[PDB]
Symmetry: D2
Subunit: 250 residues, 4 copies
């Protein structure tokens, strides 16, 4: 496996359906050692269980709304690990009411603020807090994005703005940390397990004529966290079966 | 002129150096009737003076931090105008400390929040509040962005994230309002009066010079006019070709 | 009109349906003085008639396959005009058999060569030949492109490759001539008068919920040929009613 | 390795400095079985030697100017291999005179034609000829591009137009073959050993250094493997972040 010796912290793993689980599993299959965060105490047990199946006992509470908690994760993790080789940002949130229907009717100041703070600011906040552990290690950050960053799409609404902010954050973080040997890249993932019809629309219209899997996203993340991708930084890689590059599909 | 009789509300005109002034002047030259906002009471007199030179007595306070104030503008403006044909978003802010040096060292939660709220959320907030006045008129919104949206650049830092959010907001607003006959477009302007930034751009862009507020202004006038009726959700680069050049030693 | 005093050469005007006619008409309405090319002698009369309705007697044969003919246009035009303020490239060709069905089955070396030579090389060839007349005049070139340059689309096939070549040509030409006061920009136009269903697909899916007109393309060209756009060069402007920036339209 | 048993044809390997060599080596390290093309008979021996060090005796003449030769490669290769899992396009050419100085002064019809035919048409020509061998295998094509496709750069000139054509060819090929289980992707590589170009990039990119053929090679190996099965029509930048940086004085 090409992540032998790599130590990787993974956010956003709330179930076996989650993108972060696909990433965790892919990384574990390539020999990485893993650690995880959970946002709320209700999920702790479930996350510890998933971690254990992935050979990890390293699980930490981290509400990315809190600078203290973010920093505490790395202080606690640093007791176990000499350094951090990988960091996976797979977290986003916006109030449900802002994520459907008319873009302007559904948006509000509060939903905007929340969406950007949790979904976009969290990337540089985590990179900043991880920086002492990651610098000088030829390490890597991967963050998950979505086509709403760069295209107007139905129902994504304010999250589109937040993902665009995130994607810029990826570029700025990469430009910031490259000299210290830390890479930062994104994956714009296609939709995964109107939602049934979204999936159908994509599978009918993309070059691969199917939806992508968490394994496909996971393996791309594993590559971007590995030294195999050492020439790549500030990149958004589309794992959508070619969807974004197709047009005029009647 | 090609904006003859068009009624246009312009934000961000704080001086004759401002991008918004260049836009105002360009629109006035094409026959538009103008109205303006000012952020703080200290600027009222100065903005009323500029408005008057552009043949306008329509000036309103609007701190885009305030939903009350945003909506009040359109209530007050609607007493004078039956409808609104144009809306110009030319406002942005981030704490000065967040806009130089190392990106991660200079960033903070508060500066991030402020930068996005004032610089990005303000576009959909203004479009939303203007919607009753603008819909059904084949009207137009124009917002100002910057290269930091789509490239990592030194010293722009968190504003880059905020402009990227804005540019997505332009796309989503355009997709939202197109059916009601409202367009929404952006201009990514090159730098305009840091001395070395300007010099770097003038040495490296195809035109070998910096762009002017007149050039940004005329592009805005075009994007506010019916001449651009086939264009929406677009970011147009008025940077003398800077963004499309590379590997210039 | 904002093209007062401007002298503009327009290629590709073969009928009143053509994009170039929309451009000619738009430019004439803003006060430009026009000249035109025609590729084959069969069209001469028809083009002279259209020119005359647009107040022009300046019509020249120009097969862009021929360097001699390209150069001759500017030698002949230079007898009438002190300089050239505008140049509109609205020409493209590929063999019909290469423009439908499966991309690889339909492509051939010969069709590729022809498509690129006529549709892409013609831009720098025309800019080069026009350069003595255009330099120092604060003049402008506009070329027409299509979404196939930057997205995979059905049926456009090799023309997509040719348009991508063209769009790069626009950038390189702009970078080349900017110092001499010549701008070069593109318009990526949406479809205009499976073709009936293409038009329907676009009108159902773009932000404006309709197809664009030759007037809308024409007015954008007029702007890009005018001094109002003096800050803009190397740009591709999408006149497609927002189509290219939308996605996941179910 | 993650290409274990994969059978991959590689073009453009003319020396150990070549991008294609970096790709070959990276693929061999992941367990791929390799075959190679050479453009001219003068290079045959040198290419056979390199192939042998990479455990291959499968080497074929292929001047991509020739449809006969392109198709012959696959007829000859098909005698040894039941099918083809990977195809690497790492070839490009334009007359030297067209690749420096003023873009319009340096360009010509002939140089344009040659550059596009050899550098761009060769991708769909090779994909087409390989299609019977590749279809139904969950196989992959990778092609090499350069920033000149999407930015105006000094000295690349007409090759920029040719690479843009290539990148569109990658998209169209991907859209064409995806249903048959063949992917097609590109790598836009940073410069690799002009001395000042390399210096400019190393001073300006996020990584503050030039990329290596190993880095390009490993990315190609990934894009040729099933690990990348969700990715097609993509251009991946292996340039140490160069293309995403701007305004660096």
């Amino acid at each position: 496996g090409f992540l032998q010796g790599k130590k990787i912290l993974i956010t956003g793993m709330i179930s076996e359906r989650s993108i972060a689980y696909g990433i965790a599993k892919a990384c574990r299959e390539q020999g990485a050692e893993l650690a995880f965060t959970y946002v709320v105490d209700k999920l702790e047990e479930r996350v510890r269980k998933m971690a254990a199946e992935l050979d990890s006992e390293l699980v930490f509470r981290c509400d990315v709304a809190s600078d203290d908690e973010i920093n505490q994760v790395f202080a606690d993790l640093g007791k176990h690990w000499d350094g951090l080789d990988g960091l996976v940002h797979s977290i986003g949130f916006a109030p449900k009411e802002a994520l459907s229907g008319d873009f302007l009717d559904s948006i509000s100041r509060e939903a905007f603020n929340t969406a950007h703070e949790i979904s976009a600011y969290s990337l540089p906040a985590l990179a900043k807090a991880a920086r002492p552990m990651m610098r000088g290690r030829n390490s890597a950050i991967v963050a998950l994005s979505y086509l709403g960053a760069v295209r107007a799409i139905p129902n994504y609404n304010v999250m589109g703005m937040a993902k665009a902010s995130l994607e810029a954050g990826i570029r700025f973080t990469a430009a910031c940390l490259g000299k210290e040997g830390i890479r930062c890249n994104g994956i714009s993932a296609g939709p995964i397990k109107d939602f049934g019809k979204l999936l159908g629309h994509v599978a009918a219209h993309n070059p691969l004529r199917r939806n992508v899997t968490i394994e496909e996203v996971g393996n791309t993340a594993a590559f971007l966290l590995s030294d195999l991708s050492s020439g790549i930084t500030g990149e958004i890689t589309y794992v959508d079966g070619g969807y974004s590059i197709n047009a005029l599909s009647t």
